[PDB]
Ligand binder design. Structure first.
Ligand SMILES: [Cl-]
Ligand SMILES: [Cl-]
Lengths: 101, 95
């Protein structure tokens, strides 16, 4: 579901990721997703408009927008957080990547 | 570059030209239009023409591809900008 962050049921490429695909669009076997990376790994010189910083638990995470990917639903694990309140920042990052707003 | 289709298996580069990743690029793979019936949404999966063949943009299979794998430019679909923009916006924002 849109704006919810999940865990990857596989042990290899992602820790966490944000589902950014519309809830009105059923692929149905896949889902558009943006992986999250620990905010410490990136300096604060990196655009927060293209790579917004989100908070889950007591940690900061960077949305790796440019690494968006289609992930099959059978690999989407447990719901970890709901970032609906960051809708505006997430929408802007995606729109910037495609339409250079 | 945006709206240009490349090879390695065809795909359309849909990422802004103002945004350098730089090592990767947002892309939408193309599949032969014969493989899908015409009951499949042309709004979410627009039909494009390259050469003397029809292709379906597999929007829901969008992916980040490393630039070193992007081959020869095959076509420029800039004139289909509106349909491509609508398909992407539909997938994310359910317009
Ligand atoms: Cl947050
Ligand atoms: Cl066309």
């Amino acid at each position: 579901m849109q704006f919810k962050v999940y865990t990857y049921k596989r042990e290899s490429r992602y820790r966490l990721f944000v589902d950014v695909q519309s809830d009105i669009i059923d692929t149905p076997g896949r889902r558009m997703v943006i992986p999250l990376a620990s905010a410490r790994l990136l300096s604060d010189k990196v655009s927060r408009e293209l790579y917004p910083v989100v908070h889950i638990g007591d940690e900061s995470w960077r949305m790796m927008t440019t690494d968006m990917a289609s992930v099959p639903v059978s690999v989407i694990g447990e719901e970890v957080a709901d970032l609906s309140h960051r809708e505006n920042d997430i929408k802007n990052a995606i729109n910037l990547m495609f339409w250079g707003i």
